[PDB]
Amino acid sequence: ESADLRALAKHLYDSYIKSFPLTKAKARAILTGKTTDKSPFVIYDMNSLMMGEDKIKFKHITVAIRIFQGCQFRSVEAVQEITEYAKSIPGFVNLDLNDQVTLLKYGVHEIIYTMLASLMNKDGVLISEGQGFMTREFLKSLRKPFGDFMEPKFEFAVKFNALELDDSDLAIFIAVIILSGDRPGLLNVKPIEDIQDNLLQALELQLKLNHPESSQLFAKLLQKMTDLRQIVTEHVQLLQVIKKTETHPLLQEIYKDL
Amino acid sequence: DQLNPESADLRALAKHLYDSYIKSFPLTKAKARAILTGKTTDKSPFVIYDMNSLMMGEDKVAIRIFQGCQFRSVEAVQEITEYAKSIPGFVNLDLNDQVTLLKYGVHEIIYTMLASLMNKDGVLISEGQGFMTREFLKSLRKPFGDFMEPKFEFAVKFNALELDDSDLAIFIAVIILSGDRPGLLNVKPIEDIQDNLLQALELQLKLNHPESSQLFAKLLQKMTDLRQIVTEHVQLLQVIKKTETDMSLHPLLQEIYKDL
Ligand SMILES: CCO[C@@H](Cc1ccc(OCCN2c3ccccc3Oc3ccccc32)cc1)C(=O)O
């Protein structure tokens, strides 16, 4: 039923808004777009960093490393947002808690690199709630171990953004990724898929009404997950090698592995 | 529900791909399910489940079994190749782009075709005449016993979709005409052809499996499993390259494997 799918969308979008501070609109204004009225601190040098870090304020402060530990803080911060969001997806709370937890522990990575793309352009990604901007070439130029961490995220986002999806389209697409269903260790895989399908239908009507002129956008968007999985896979890989570099107590704890 | 000149051309594409499909690959899935379900015994499969069996299966090791899979795939590449030529637009693209799509597409497809030759217990071999068991394979010399396992895992969740050849023919095409492949020169032309193949598929499903809701989405996601599989395969494949040096990989499979 058209209306049903339409309201499921308004609801989810409404949730996307209260769960996520930096919406993609609010982030395009600030980014490559003019708007904003007053741009963010740009970090392109080892010196702009010290200045931005010392002036742009910061939470994760106690080079190539301090940056990594930077993502981590924001990620661990993201995950909390995504999770409070998942809890609004109709019927998510009603699933087996063991399942719910497995859906997050597994889909939280893709919902990040998905939303990261909203804060990206070919030359860099917004930082600190958009109050900053770290150039892309600065990042790829970091110490040997850390110069490939964010590069493949750029390569993806450049493609993902190709679809020019807005918030309301991403709110649904995101739901669809959480109510995955093929995550290892799931107990009652049925109600999950039962909801995803109810999410997938809403994505369709949504992507059809919001991008009528975009041919087979639904198909194209679904195949981007084949790209997210590869990022998250290739990512967790590097994330292993970093342990053959870093090798704390109460911190190493707060950052299990996100 | 209804019709329209729009859908019409697609259907004709659905039928064109299906025809060239049946024409390109000898062993379809239909003939595959026939053999596998011992319900139809107009001609049944010999079974290999241990060395003893394997030994007698020549009446009509872990290495030679390997040079078997290897050989089959060279022929499967050929079949997929010829099938590609028949894909509307493909032979019109830059000769290079063609070589690229065939490059990063042959396996993601060979593992699709492979699922229609499988079932939890085993897989068909030698045109469907034989049937090797998961167990036996999963018990070959230390390294060679991990090759096929991940295939079965996939074939299992894949076949779950319940797709028949007229569906695979379109999806098998949607795979070649990718566009997000490494080393492509002109892309939008490649993208355009596919956005069409996709249109065909989305219809061929909503029509051939009416009751199967969101089969279009469920199936596109399965493409992830294929990359992973190709990944894992190449690395295990990398190992046999250094441990077994007296052994030889096939030039074709060799030239097709040179990137991520
Ligand atoms: C080692 C070769 O790896 C190939 C890929 C590949 C792997 C498995 C395949 O399934 C083949 C199934 N099969 C088979 C399985 C086990 C032993 C022998 C044997 O021979 C035949 C003969 C006819 C049909 C099917 C088979 C295909 C390609 C490659 O990397 O390119």
Side-chain angles (χ1 to χ4, degrees), chain A residues 159 176 180 182 193 196-197 200-201 204 208 215-216 218-220 222-227 229-230 233-234, chain B residues 157 174 180 191 194-195 198-200 202 213-218 220-225 227-228 231 260:
Chain A
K159 273 183 270 196
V176 175
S180 220
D182 43 274
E193 307 218 301
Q196 200 188 211
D197 287 52
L200 284 181
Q201 278 167 55
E204 267 199 305
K208 285 187 171 184
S215 156
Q216 213 63 64
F218 190 67
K220 295 175 204 181
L222 292 171
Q223 27 164 46
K224 244 64 212 61
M225 298 167 70
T226 293
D227 296 274
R229 242 82 160 177
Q230 269 287 183
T233 288
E234 205 168 58
Chain B
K157 44 169 132 68
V174 160
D180 263 19
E191 307 244 292
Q194 183 201 285
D195 308 307
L198 296 179
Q199 275 190 297
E202 179 180 52
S213 196
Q214 233 65 61
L215 173 52
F216 189 37
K218 304 279 182 189
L220 294 167
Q221 319 200 51
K222 292 285 177 300
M223 285 173 97
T224 306
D225 296 281
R227 257 286 174 182
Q228 309 303 311
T231 325
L260 262 273

Short mmCIF file of all heavy atoms in Angstrom, two decimals, chain A residues 159 176 180 182 193 196-197 200-201 204 208 215-216 218-220 222-227 229-230 233-234, chain B residues 157 174 180 191 194-195 198-200 202 213-218 220-225 227-228 231 260:
data_model
loop_
_atom_site.label_atom_id
_atom_site.label_comp_id
_atom_site.label_asym_id
_atom_site.label_seq_id
_atom_site.Cartn_x
_atom_site.Cartn_y
_atom_site.Cartn_z
N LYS A 159 31.99 7.43 -5.80
CA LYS A 159 31.04 6.64 -6.57
C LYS A 159 29.66 6.70 -5.92
O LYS A 159 28.67 7.02 -6.57
CB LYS A 159 31.51 5.18 -6.70
CG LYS A 159 32.43 4.95 -7.90
CD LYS A 159 32.85 3.50 -8.09
CE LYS A 159 34.12 3.17 -7.34
NZ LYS A 159 34.73 1.89 -7.84
N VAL A 176 17.48 -0.64 5.65
CA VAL A 176 17.69 -1.85 4.89
C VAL A 176 19.02 -2.55 5.24
O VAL A 176 19.06 -3.78 5.29
CB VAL A 176 17.63 -1.57 3.38
CG1 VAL A 176 17.97 -2.81 2.60
CG2 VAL A 176 16.22 -1.12 3.01
N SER A 180 19.69 -6.53 7.88
CA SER A 180 20.36 -7.36 6.90
C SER A 180 19.73 -8.75 6.87
O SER A 180 18.78 -8.98 6.12
CB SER A 180 21.85 -7.45 7.22
OG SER A 180 22.65 -7.40 6.05
N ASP A 182 21.72 -11.81 6.71
CA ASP A 182 22.69 -12.84 6.42
C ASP A 182 23.90 -12.68 7.32
O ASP A 182 24.99 -13.16 7.02
CB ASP A 182 23.09 -12.83 4.93
CG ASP A 182 23.32 -11.42 4.37
OD1 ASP A 182 22.33 -10.77 3.93
OD2 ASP A 182 24.48 -10.96 4.36
N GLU A 193 14.35 -10.53 7.79
CA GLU A 193 14.07 -10.47 6.36
C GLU A 193 12.65 -9.98 6.12
O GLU A 193 12.37 -9.32 5.13
CB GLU A 193 14.24 -11.85 5.75
CG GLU A 193 15.59 -12.45 6.05
CD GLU A 193 16.15 -13.21 4.86
OE1 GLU A 193 15.47 -14.16 4.41
OE2 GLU A 193 17.26 -12.85 4.39
N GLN A 196 13.21 -6.23 6.42
CA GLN A 196 14.04 -5.70 5.35
C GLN A 196 13.20 -5.53 4.09
O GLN A 196 13.23 -4.47 3.45
CB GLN A 196 15.24 -6.62 5.04
CG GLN A 196 16.37 -5.89 4.30
CD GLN A 196 17.50 -6.80 3.81
OE1 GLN A 196 18.66 -6.40 3.74
NE2 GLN A 196 17.16 -8.04 3.45
N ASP A 197 12.44 -6.57 3.74
CA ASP A 197 11.58 -6.55 2.56
C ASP A 197 10.58 -5.42 2.62
O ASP A 197 10.21 -4.83 1.61
CB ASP A 197 10.83 -7.88 2.41
CG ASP A 197 11.74 -9.01 1.96
OD1 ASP A 197 12.80 -9.22 2.60
OD2 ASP A 197 11.40 -9.70 0.97
N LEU A 200 12.81 -2.50 1.89
CA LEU A 200 13.17 -2.48 0.46
C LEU A 200 12.04 -1.94 -0.41
O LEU A 200 12.29 -1.21 -1.38
CB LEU A 200 13.57 -3.88 -0.01
CG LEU A 200 14.97 -4.32 0.43
CD1 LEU A 200 15.30 -5.68 -0.11
CD2 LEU A 200 15.99 -3.33 -0.10
N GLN A 201 10.81 -2.27 -0.08
CA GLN A 201 9.69 -1.76 -0.85
C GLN A 201 9.63 -0.24 -0.71
O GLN A 201 9.45 0.47 -1.70
CB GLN A 201 8.37 -2.38 -0.39
CG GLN A 201 8.10 -3.76 -0.99
CD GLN A 201 6.96 -4.50 -0.29
OE1 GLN A 201 5.85 -4.00 -0.16
NE2 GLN A 201 7.26 -5.72 0.17
N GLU A 204 12.23 1.57 -2.80
CA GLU A 204 11.75 1.65 -4.19
C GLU A 204 10.82 2.83 -4.48
O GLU A 204 11.08 3.63 -5.37
CB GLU A 204 11.02 0.37 -4.59
CG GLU A 204 11.88 -0.68 -5.28
CD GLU A 204 11.05 -1.70 -6.05
OE1 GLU A 204 10.15 -2.32 -5.43
OE2 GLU A 204 11.29 -1.87 -7.27
N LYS A 208 11.81 6.14 -6.43
CA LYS A 208 11.08 6.33 -7.67
C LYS A 208 10.38 7.68 -7.69
O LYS A 208 10.30 8.32 -8.74
CB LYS A 208 10.06 5.19 -7.87
CG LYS A 208 10.71 3.88 -8.28
CD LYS A 208 9.68 2.81 -8.63
CE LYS A 208 10.36 1.59 -9.25
NZ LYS A 208 9.39 0.54 -9.70
N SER A 215 17.13 6.31 -13.94
CA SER A 215 16.86 4.95 -14.39
C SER A 215 17.48 3.86 -13.52
O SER A 215 18.69 3.84 -13.29
CB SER A 215 17.34 4.78 -15.84
OG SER A 215 17.61 3.42 -16.17
N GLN A 216 16.63 2.95 -13.05
CA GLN A 216 17.06 1.81 -12.25
C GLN A 216 17.96 2.24 -11.10
O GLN A 216 19.01 1.64 -10.87
CB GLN A 216 17.80 0.81 -13.15
CG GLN A 216 17.62 -0.65 -12.76
CD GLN A 216 16.18 -1.11 -12.87
OE1 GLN A 216 15.61 -1.15 -13.96
NE2 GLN A 216 15.58 -1.46 -11.74
N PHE A 218 17.18 2.12 -7.94
CA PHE A 218 17.02 1.10 -6.90
C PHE A 218 18.06 -0.01 -7.11
O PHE A 218 18.81 -0.35 -6.20
CB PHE A 218 15.62 0.51 -6.95
CG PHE A 218 15.29 -0.37 -5.79
CD1 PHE A 218 15.18 0.17 -4.52
CD2 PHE A 218 15.10 -1.73 -5.97
CE1 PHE A 218 14.89 -0.65 -3.43
CE2 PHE A 218 14.81 -2.56 -4.89
CZ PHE A 218 14.71 -2.01 -3.62
N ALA A 219 18.11 -0.57 -8.30
CA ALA A 219 19.08 -1.62 -8.58
C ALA A 219 20.50 -1.13 -8.27
O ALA A 219 21.25 -1.80 -7.56
CB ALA A 219 18.98 -2.06 -10.04
N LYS A 220 20.86 0.03 -8.82
CA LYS A 220 22.19 0.62 -8.65
C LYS A 220 22.58 0.87 -7.20
O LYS A 220 23.75 0.69 -6.84
CB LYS A 220 22.32 1.94 -9.43
CG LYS A 220 22.21 1.79 -10.94
CD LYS A 220 22.21 3.16 -11.61
CE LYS A 220 21.55 3.11 -12.97
NZ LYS A 220 21.57 4.44 -13.64
N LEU A 222 21.35 -0.82 -4.50
CA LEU A 222 21.54 -2.12 -3.86
C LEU A 222 22.92 -2.70 -4.18
O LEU A 222 23.52 -3.35 -3.34
CB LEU A 222 20.47 -3.12 -4.31
CG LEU A 222 19.03 -2.87 -3.86
CD1 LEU A 222 18.10 -3.80 -4.57
CD2 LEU A 222 18.91 -3.05 -2.37
N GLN A 223 23.41 -2.47 -5.39
CA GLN A 223 24.71 -3.01 -5.74
C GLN A 223 25.88 -2.25 -5.13
O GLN A 223 27.04 -2.62 -5.34
CB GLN A 223 24.88 -3.08 -7.26
CG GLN A 223 24.07 -2.06 -8.02
CD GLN A 223 24.54 -1.91 -9.45
OE1 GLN A 223 24.78 -2.91 -10.16
NE2 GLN A 223 24.68 -0.66 -9.90
N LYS A 224 25.58 -1.21 -4.36
CA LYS A 224 26.63 -0.43 -3.72
C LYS A 224 27.04 -1.13 -2.43
O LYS A 224 28.09 -0.82 -1.84
CB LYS A 224 26.15 0.99 -3.44
CG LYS A 224 26.91 2.07 -4.20
CD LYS A 224 26.70 1.93 -5.70
CE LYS A 224 27.92 2.37 -6.46
NZ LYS A 224 29.09 1.52 -6.10
N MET A 225 26.21 -2.07 -2.00
CA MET A 225 26.47 -2.84 -0.79
C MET A 225 27.56 -3.84 -1.10
O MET A 225 28.31 -4.25 -0.22
CB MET A 225 25.21 -3.55 -0.35
CG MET A 225 24.10 -2.59 -0.01
SD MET A 225 22.53 -3.42 0.15
CE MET A 225 22.82 -4.34 1.71
N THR A 226 27.66 -4.23 -2.36
CA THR A 226 28.71 -5.15 -2.77
C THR A 226 30.03 -4.36 -2.68
O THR A 226 31.12 -4.94 -2.69
CB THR A 226 28.49 -5.66 -4.23
OG1 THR A 226 27.31 -6.47 -4.28
CG2 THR A 226 29.68 -6.48 -4.71
N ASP A 227 29.92 -3.04 -2.58
CA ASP A 227 31.09 -2.18 -2.47
C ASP A 227 31.40 -1.91 -1.00
O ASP A 227 32.57 -1.85 -0.61
CB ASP A 227 30.88 -0.86 -3.20
CG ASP A 227 30.70 -1.04 -4.69
OD1 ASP A 227 31.72 -1.10 -5.41
OD2 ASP A 227 29.53 -1.14 -5.14
N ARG A 229 30.67 -3.89 1.53
CA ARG A 229 31.19 -5.11 2.12
C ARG A 229 32.68 -5.23 1.87
O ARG A 229 33.44 -5.66 2.74
CB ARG A 229 30.47 -6.32 1.53
CG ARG A 229 29.69 -7.15 2.53
CD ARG A 229 28.30 -6.60 2.84
NE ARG A 229 27.45 -7.65 3.42
CZ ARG A 229 26.20 -7.49 3.85
NH1 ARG A 229 25.61 -6.30 3.79
NH2 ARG A 229 25.53 -8.52 4.34
N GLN A 230 33.11 -4.85 0.67
CA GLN A 230 34.52 -4.90 0.30
C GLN A 230 35.35 -3.87 1.07
O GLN A 230 36.52 -4.09 1.38
CB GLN A 230 34.67 -4.66 -1.19
CG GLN A 230 34.65 -5.92 -2.02
CD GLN A 230 35.93 -6.72 -1.88
OE1 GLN A 230 36.10 -7.75 -2.54
NE2 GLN A 230 36.83 -6.25 -1.03
N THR A 233 35.56 -5.12 4.62
CA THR A 233 36.41 -6.30 4.68
C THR A 233 37.87 -5.89 4.58
O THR A 233 38.69 -6.26 5.41
CB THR A 233 36.09 -7.27 3.54
OG1 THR A 233 34.83 -7.89 3.79
CG2 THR A 233 37.18 -8.32 3.42
N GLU A 234 38.17 -5.10 3.55
CA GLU A 234 39.52 -4.63 3.32
C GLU A 234 39.93 -3.70 4.46
O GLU A 234 41.12 -3.59 4.78
CB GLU A 234 39.58 -3.90 1.98
CG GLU A 234 40.96 -3.87 1.34
CD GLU A 234 40.91 -3.39 -0.11
OE1 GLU A 234 40.42 -2.26 -0.34
OE2 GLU A 234 41.36 -4.14 -1.01
N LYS B 157 23.18 -20.96 0.07
CA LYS B 157 22.35 -19.78 0.31
C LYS B 157 21.88 -19.17 -0.99
O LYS B 157 20.87 -18.47 -1.03
CB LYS B 157 23.08 -18.71 1.16
CG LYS B 157 24.55 -18.38 0.82
CD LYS B 157 25.04 -17.10 1.57
CE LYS B 157 26.42 -17.26 2.29
NZ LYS B 157 27.63 -17.43 1.41
N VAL B 174 24.07 -9.10 -16.24
CA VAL B 174 24.15 -7.94 -15.37
C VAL B 174 25.51 -7.90 -14.68
O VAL B 174 26.00 -6.83 -14.32
CB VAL B 174 23.04 -7.98 -14.30
CG1 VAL B 174 23.40 -7.09 -13.13
CG2 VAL B 174 21.72 -7.55 -14.93
N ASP B 180 31.93 -0.85 -12.66
CA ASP B 180 32.73 -0.44 -11.52
C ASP B 180 33.95 -1.35 -11.43
O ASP B 180 34.46 -1.62 -10.34
CB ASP B 180 31.89 -0.49 -10.24
CG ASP B 180 31.33 0.87 -9.86
OD1 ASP B 180 31.27 1.76 -10.74
OD2 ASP B 180 30.93 1.05 -8.68
N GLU B 191 27.75 1.31 -18.37
CA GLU B 191 26.73 1.51 -17.36
C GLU B 191 25.35 1.45 -18.02
O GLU B 191 24.45 0.78 -17.53
CB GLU B 191 26.90 2.86 -16.67
CG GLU B 191 28.30 3.09 -16.10
CD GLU B 191 28.31 3.22 -14.58
OE1 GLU B 191 27.78 4.23 -14.06
OE2 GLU B 191 28.85 2.31 -13.91
N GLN B 194 23.99 -2.02 -18.98
CA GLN B 194 23.59 -2.74 -17.79
C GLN B 194 22.30 -2.25 -17.15
O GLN B 194 21.50 -3.06 -16.68
CB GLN B 194 24.70 -2.72 -16.75
CG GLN B 194 24.34 -3.53 -15.52
CD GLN B 194 25.16 -3.13 -14.32
OE1 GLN B 194 26.34 -3.47 -14.21
NE2 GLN B 194 24.54 -2.38 -13.42
N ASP B 195 22.10 -0.93 -17.11
CA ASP B 195 20.90 -0.37 -16.50
C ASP B 195 19.69 -0.89 -17.23
O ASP B 195 18.55 -0.75 -16.78
CB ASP B 195 20.94 1.15 -16.56
CG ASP B 195 22.25 1.71 -16.00
OD1 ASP B 195 22.62 1.36 -14.86
OD2 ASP B 195 22.90 2.50 -16.72
N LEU B 198 19.53 -4.78 -16.17
CA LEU B 198 18.88 -4.73 -14.87
C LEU B 198 17.39 -4.60 -15.04
O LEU B 198 16.62 -5.30 -14.37
CB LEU B 198 19.39 -3.53 -14.05
CG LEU B 198 20.87 -3.51 -13.66
CD1 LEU B 198 21.16 -2.24 -12.89
CD2 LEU B 198 21.20 -4.73 -12.82
N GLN B 199 16.96 -3.72 -15.93
CA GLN B 199 15.54 -3.53 -16.17
C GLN B 199 14.94 -4.87 -16.58
O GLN B 199 13.86 -5.26 -16.10
CB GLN B 199 15.29 -2.50 -17.28
CG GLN B 199 15.28 -1.05 -16.82
CD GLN B 199 14.79 -0.10 -17.91
OE1 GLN B 199 15.40 0.02 -18.98
NE2 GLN B 199 13.66 0.58 -17.65
N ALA B 200 15.64 -5.58 -17.47
CA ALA B 200 15.19 -6.88 -17.94
C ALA B 200 14.98 -7.78 -16.72
O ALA B 200 13.87 -8.25 -16.46
CB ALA B 200 16.22 -7.49 -18.89
N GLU B 202 14.83 -7.23 -13.35
CA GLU B 202 13.77 -6.81 -12.44
C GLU B 202 12.39 -7.25 -12.90
O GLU B 202 11.48 -7.43 -12.10
CB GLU B 202 13.76 -5.29 -12.25
CG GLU B 202 12.64 -4.87 -11.30
CD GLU B 202 12.55 -3.39 -11.07
OE1 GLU B 202 12.51 -2.64 -12.07
OE2 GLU B 202 12.51 -2.98 -9.88
N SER B 213 8.55 -12.07 -3.30
CA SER B 213 8.71 -10.63 -3.13
C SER B 213 10.16 -10.19 -2.84
O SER B 213 10.88 -10.82 -2.02
CB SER B 213 7.77 -10.14 -2.03
OG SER B 213 7.62 -8.73 -2.08
N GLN B 214 10.58 -9.12 -3.51
CA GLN B 214 11.92 -8.55 -3.36
C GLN B 214 13.04 -9.50 -3.74
O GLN B 214 14.15 -9.42 -3.20
CB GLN B 214 12.13 -8.09 -1.92
CG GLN B 214 12.58 -6.66 -1.81
CD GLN B 214 11.54 -5.70 -2.32
OE1 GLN B 214 10.43 -5.64 -1.78
NE2 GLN B 214 11.88 -4.95 -3.36
N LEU B 215 12.75 -10.40 -4.68
CA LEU B 215 13.74 -11.35 -5.15
C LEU B 215 14.82 -10.59 -5.91
O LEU B 215 15.98 -11.01 -5.96
CB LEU B 215 13.07 -12.40 -6.04
CG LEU B 215 14.00 -13.39 -6.76
CD1 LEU B 215 14.96 -14.04 -5.78
CD2 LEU B 215 13.16 -14.41 -7.46
N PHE B 216 14.44 -9.46 -6.50
CA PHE B 216 15.37 -8.63 -7.26
C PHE B 216 16.47 -8.12 -6.33
O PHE B 216 17.66 -8.27 -6.62
CB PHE B 216 14.62 -7.44 -7.88
CG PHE B 216 15.44 -6.64 -8.86
CD1 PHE B 216 16.34 -7.28 -9.72
CD2 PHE B 216 15.30 -5.26 -8.94
CE1 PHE B 216 17.08 -6.55 -10.64
CE2 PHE B 216 16.04 -4.52 -9.86
CZ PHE B 216 16.93 -5.17 -10.71
N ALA B 217 16.06 -7.54 -5.20
CA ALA B 217 17.02 -7.04 -4.23
C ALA B 217 17.84 -8.18 -3.63
O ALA B 217 19.08 -8.15 -3.67
CB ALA B 217 16.28 -6.28 -3.13
N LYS B 218 17.14 -9.18 -3.09
CA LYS B 218 17.77 -10.35 -2.46
C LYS B 218 18.85 -10.94 -3.33
O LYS B 218 19.87 -11.41 -2.83
CB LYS B 218 16.73 -11.44 -2.19
CG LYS B 218 15.55 -11.02 -1.35
CD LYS B 218 15.87 -11.01 0.13
CE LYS B 218 14.65 -10.62 0.95
NZ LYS B 218 14.99 -10.40 2.40
N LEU B 220 20.56 -9.26 -5.94
CA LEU B 220 21.66 -8.35 -6.24
C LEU B 220 22.67 -8.36 -5.11
O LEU B 220 23.88 -8.24 -5.34
CB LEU B 220 21.13 -6.93 -6.47
CG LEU B 220 20.25 -6.77 -7.72
CD1 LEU B 220 19.53 -5.43 -7.68
CD2 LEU B 220 21.10 -6.92 -8.97
N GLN B 221 22.18 -8.51 -3.88
CA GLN B 221 23.07 -8.53 -2.72
C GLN B 221 24.00 -9.72 -2.77
O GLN B 221 25.17 -9.63 -2.39
CB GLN B 221 22.25 -8.56 -1.44
CG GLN B 221 21.04 -7.66 -1.49
CD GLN B 221 20.50 -7.32 -0.12
OE1 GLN B 221 21.24 -6.88 0.75
NE2 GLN B 221 19.19 -7.52 0.08
N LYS B 222 23.49 -10.84 -3.26
CA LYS B 222 24.28 -12.07 -3.35
C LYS B 222 25.58 -11.85 -4.12
O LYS B 222 26.49 -12.68 -4.07
CB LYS B 222 23.46 -13.18 -4.00
CG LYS B 222 22.30 -13.65 -3.14
CD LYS B 222 22.78 -14.52 -1.99
CE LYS B 222 21.62 -14.92 -1.10
NZ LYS B 222 20.93 -13.73 -0.54
N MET B 223 25.67 -10.74 -4.83
CA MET B 223 26.88 -10.45 -5.59
C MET B 223 28.08 -10.26 -4.65
O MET B 223 29.23 -10.48 -5.06
CB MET B 223 26.66 -9.21 -6.47
CG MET B 223 25.81 -9.48 -7.71
SD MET B 223 25.37 -8.00 -8.67
CE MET B 223 26.64 -8.00 -9.99
N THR B 224 27.81 -9.86 -3.41
CA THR B 224 28.88 -9.64 -2.43
C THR B 224 29.65 -10.93 -2.18
O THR B 224 30.88 -10.97 -2.24
CB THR B 224 28.32 -9.19 -1.08
OG1 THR B 224 27.49 -8.04 -1.24
CG2 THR B 224 29.47 -8.86 -0.15
N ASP B 225 28.89 -11.98 -1.89
CA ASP B 225 29.43 -13.30 -1.61
C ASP B 225 30.41 -13.72 -2.70
O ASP B 225 31.43 -14.35 -2.42
CB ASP B 225 28.29 -14.33 -1.52
CG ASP B 225 27.34 -14.05 -0.36
OD1 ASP B 225 27.69 -14.39 0.79
OD2 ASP B 225 26.24 -13.49 -0.59
N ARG B 227 32.38 -11.80 -4.71
CA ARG B 227 33.68 -11.14 -4.63
C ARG B 227 34.49 -11.89 -3.57
O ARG B 227 35.55 -12.44 -3.85
CB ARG B 227 33.53 -9.66 -4.26
CG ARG B 227 33.69 -8.68 -5.42
CD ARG B 227 35.15 -8.51 -5.89
NE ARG B 227 35.24 -7.66 -7.08
CZ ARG B 227 36.36 -7.37 -7.74
NH1 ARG B 227 37.54 -7.85 -7.34
NH2 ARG B 227 36.30 -6.59 -8.82
N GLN B 228 33.95 -11.90 -2.35
CA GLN B 228 34.60 -12.58 -1.23
C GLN B 228 35.16 -13.91 -1.71
O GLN B 228 36.36 -14.16 -1.60
CB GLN B 228 33.60 -12.82 -0.09
CG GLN B 228 32.79 -11.60 0.36
CD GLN B 228 33.66 -10.42 0.79
OE1 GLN B 228 34.59 -10.57 1.59
NE2 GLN B 228 33.34 -9.23 0.28
N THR B 231 38.03 -13.70 -3.85
CA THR B 231 39.13 -13.25 -3.01
C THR B 231 39.84 -14.43 -2.38
O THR B 231 41.01 -14.69 -2.65
CB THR B 231 38.63 -12.37 -1.88
OG1 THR B 231 37.51 -11.60 -2.34
CG2 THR B 231 39.73 -11.45 -1.41
N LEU B 260 43.06 -6.89 -7.95
CA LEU B 260 42.19 -7.12 -6.80
C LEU B 260 40.73 -7.26 -7.26
O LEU B 260 39.88 -6.45 -6.83
CB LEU B 260 42.34 -5.96 -5.79
CG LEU B 260 43.26 -6.07 -4.55
CD1 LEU B 260 42.50 -6.71 -3.39
CD2 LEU B 260 44.52 -6.85 -4.89
#
